[PDB]
Symmetry: C3
Subunit: 444 residues, 3 copies
């Protein structure tokens, strides 16, 4: 017999995301190694090294082995437990029932003890079923951490490239603002301009200069993050991260069927396996409503005189079958059952929350990616217009045919446009990372 409910997987509907019909996506195939589409061999090396060196990943793998070890232990409980023992019981006292004289007592034992709960109503079977589910849950945790890790690593690499990009932009715009400052300095020294212009120019030049260490600071924080994610010290980072361009994907994104995502995501699987474990735990609690059958034994030697231990005149065996039933203490058993059922309900609600958060993350990532493309279109146009306006005002300032503020403001709007655009490009990249994270890629 095996009592209590048999686990059935929740019948949960597949994820529908209508935006996936749209043009930026390719539903016919899904890349598990999603990050390789960036065609960035450096990045690829980072991910490979991360899988070897990352310590959080190494922790989670040990926790899996621990969970399996626990399951292996539970697995043995089906079989009788045979131990060997040698003991004695010596004393001197009265023997109530037998005699009021203080008499000597001497007993010697050497043999195998055995003990065994027959799993008649499946209590042990339901434990093993639970323990197996948790074992599988720990494996899904390992895989989810891998998904997270890769996303964090790819995301961080993109932030480094963004900081480097923005640095160069700042440095390039700084040179315009030195040339422009040189020009204003020449016009006051020729008698035609004014110091007010030089001051404004030097102020703006200082402002742009202040951004460069800050961007350099962000970059260095991103290098430090990347190193810890690889399992390396910051000093000892084996991958060269010299400035290269920000990776892009010109192709439509291979995202596969979005309905598949709940089945691909290990966090969802882990929550489902915890639900299975807790469902099995209801069985364990239900079995205690029913009788418990056990069988003890002894095989070996028993004597009053030690010299006889090991001889055939002192051979001994014993058998002790027992069945026990909680005749009146069902109150406590039914309390534990009510607790088991509540934990199962919790695990079900938990599982459903994970499903909901996955659909939320997923909805969020696609929703953002679409909007981040749109935003980038108009930001690219701002950068174009601003470069054009800046160069016109420069001409017209040199010819004395407009005041400096026109050129000051045009240089200001050039910087912020270019910089806003670089931020938006980074955000596209991060949105790709968000997408594949939400779909459960990189653990296979």
């Amino acid at each position: 017999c095996t009592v209590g409910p048999d686990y059935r997987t929740p019948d949960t509907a597949a994820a529908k995301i209508d935006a996936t019909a749209s043009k930026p996506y390719d539903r016919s195939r899904f890349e598990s190694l999603w990050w390789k589409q960036f065609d960035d061999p450096t990045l690829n090396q980072l991910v490979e090294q991360s899988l070897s060196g990352n310590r959080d990943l190494r922790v989670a793998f040990a926790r899996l082995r621990a969970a399996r070890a626990l399951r292996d232990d539970v697995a043995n409980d089906r079989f009788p437990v045979v131990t060997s023992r040698a003991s004695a019981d010596i004393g001197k006292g009265q023997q109530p029932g037998v005699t009021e004289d203080r008499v000597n007592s001497e007993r010697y034992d050497l043999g195998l003890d055995s003990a065994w709960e027959l799993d008649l109503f499946g209590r042990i079977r339901r434990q093993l079923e639970s323990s197996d589910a948790l074992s599988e849950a720990a494996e899904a945790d390992l895989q989810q951490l891998q998904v997270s890790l890769i996303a964090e690593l790819v995301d961080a690499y993109g932030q480094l490239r963004g900081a480097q990009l923005r640095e160069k932009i700042a440095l390039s715009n700084l040179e315009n603002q030195k040339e422009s400052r040189q020009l204003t300095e020449q016009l006051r020294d020729a008698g035609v301009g004014a110091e007010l212009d030089v001051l404004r120019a030097d102020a703006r030049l200082a402002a742009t200069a202040a951004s460069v260490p800050q961007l350099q600071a962000e970059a260095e924080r991103a290098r430090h993050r990347i190193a810890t994610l690889l399992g390396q010290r910051p000093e000892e980072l084996t991958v060269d991260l010299s400035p290269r361009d920000l990776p892009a994907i010109t192709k439509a994104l291979p995202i596969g069927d979005p309905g598949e995502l709940l089945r691909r995501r290990p966090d969802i699987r882990a929550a489902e396996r915890r639900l299975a474990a807790s469902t099995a735990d209801v069985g364990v609690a239900t079995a205690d409503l029913f009788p418990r059958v056990s069988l003890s034994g002894f095989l070996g030697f028993t004597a009053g005189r030690g010299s006889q231990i090991g001889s055939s005149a002192a051979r001994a065996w014993s058998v002790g079958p027992s069945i026990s039933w909680a005749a009146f203490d069902l109150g406590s058993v039914r309390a534990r059952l009510r607790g088991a059922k509540a934990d199962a309900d919790a695990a079900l609600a938990s599982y459903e929350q994970q499903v909901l958060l996955a659909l939320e993350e997923s909805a969020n990532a696609f929703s953002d990616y679409g909007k981040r493309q749109e935003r980038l279109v108009s930001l690219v146009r701002q950068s174009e217009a601003s470069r054009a306006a800046a160069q016109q005002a420069a001409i017209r300032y040199r010819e004395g045919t407009t005041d400096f503020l026109v050129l000051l403001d045009a240089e200001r709007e050039q910087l912020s446009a270019e910089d806003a655009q670089a931020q938006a490009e980074v955000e596209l990249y991060r949105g790709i990372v968000a997408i594949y994270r939400s779909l459960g890629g990189g653990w296979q």
Copy 2:
């Protein structure tokens, strides 16, 4: 007897917040359903649906039932434990004391076993007292999560309305900047203007256009959040969230006496009940300093021949009273006592931290609300002035009587003023949410 300390509630002083005398607040009454004052029926529906569907809430309710089940189990420990059993002991060996011959042994038993610790010094009573306190702590957790949930939901709804508001502002200002761009385009084509103006106008137009997808992106993230908080998939959201205005409260806020807040807040109660549980646990540890009285029994049948089980010639009963005292192993008992007392101290310090954080949150919310009103006054004036300045510069640009930058900068300052004002209005709304969160509203 019941040994160890009797729990006394901490005598903690009521919250004093001097700013509550101020005009924006009404101390005569407190609205438990605080969110209904916004007069927003959509929002009301969100909260109602959230209480039904939110899975985190469903989890916490199962955890309460689990805690009660545990308490019910502990509750039984006062009574004797009677189980039924049928067993045998068969063997063949020597009988030390009796005979050196290997002899057959056969015993058969059928009856009720009973076992019972008399709770003479209140160890079990102190367990039940602990377990009851934890049970009440789990209920307070459920209520605190409800407070948090409602605040998060109302807060998120306000962010959605803010994004929608800011979107329309951006769209409205975009149209000014198209008209203005059209105008600059007309003046170059009439021979009197310049391309520099058109470029600057197209740049600024692009910048404003870039904000619209971003605001739309925020809005869509807020919808996704709201859906998960309701217990729904993003696709399946039953409440229509089409753009409507941001809710306001024209009345002074019904906040009640702020001294009441510590007594209303379930987080505080939960920490207090954990302090009570740990205080009872000192009793449990103290009881082990004292003797332990127990009583076992057997009632049924006992015989050497199985055919006799059930007959009156094989009737059997047994009684086994026992008292035990740790004569020398008080060392271990006193160690556990020292640990129990330390846990109680921890629980007390924990409780005090919760009190302090509550007063911090509370101080913060009122402090911010007051300042957010002030800020809004002057920001409304900036918006007025900026609209006026923008329309003047527009006139004077059309008449050729000022250069474009005057109109460019005036359009820029109009956008940021209007947008800063919308952000500040949202922040007022969120500050109302912060306030009622800190006072412990929505669980009743």
Copy 3:
């Protein structure tokens, strides 16, 4: 005997940070009370009071005492356990083997029971070794929390001073913008200016006014934080926090040898002690591969008639030596061993992650501090230039020799320069705090 692996400390290389050779740092000495270099007696008082009143610190100290109590309990397990007991066994039934008559049974006992596992293979010794390591781990947690607390407190105090600084800046710039607004108002009333100027001036004046409550709001949040960190209610804060200047350190920072940091940091120590505990736990699991020796006894009185208890005719003693070996159930023992080894691997990977994060935090703090100095140099120049430009434009606006926008924009750039500089100064201060946090200062 003591079986299983003997713990050896991980041989981890010292932290190398090449930037420490640089001029802003002093490696010859390290200040444990690092915060006192600010020469701020108020701050010093905050830290002193925090160490007395902070409840999180009080919690962690109770948890240490609890861990020690647990170790004390485990420590007793080496010695025999002697308890006193008085019991009886009364009944009436058959005596299988002896007689088929239902006979009366009566036994009375009064004496000392003793029980003792001889720690032959060091199972108990390895428990105590584990429990001692955890005890030391809880002490390191207390010290790490102290490091964190002090850093959070000093950091928060700096944010308060920053808000106060920025407030005064805003107020000062507000007065320029009132004077400037008054001026524009005078020029329209003399017939020579225009309303467009007044509107722009009033707009900008409102904008600056909106920042003041916001900065005041931040300040008040920082006061509330500080109070909770001290263990005080916000209302009851015993330290006067009236505006004073932001603390600086003109001297090079006493950072000591950076190689020392891993040895100084308590988080690292705590992780190492958990590794030691888990290593000892492998021993505990290994001991169960080997036989278990135990010795029970009874000393006192035993009789069939109660009146005889206490008499010498009813004297009784008993000795019960036993050795047991898992002859076939090594499967379960070896499963637990495999689990123990996995936990040890986890604890090792965990320890290595802590080392890596420490080096990351550390790398980050120095890296940022250097860059934050550079940034501040150029930001100070922006503030100088902007003040100069603002005062020039003011002159040239009064003389009617430039339009208002020139003065409007110059006032705008003055405010943001001054404000950006104050933020950068605060960030320097916070970076000092980050540094000493990462080096593990303040617990000694």
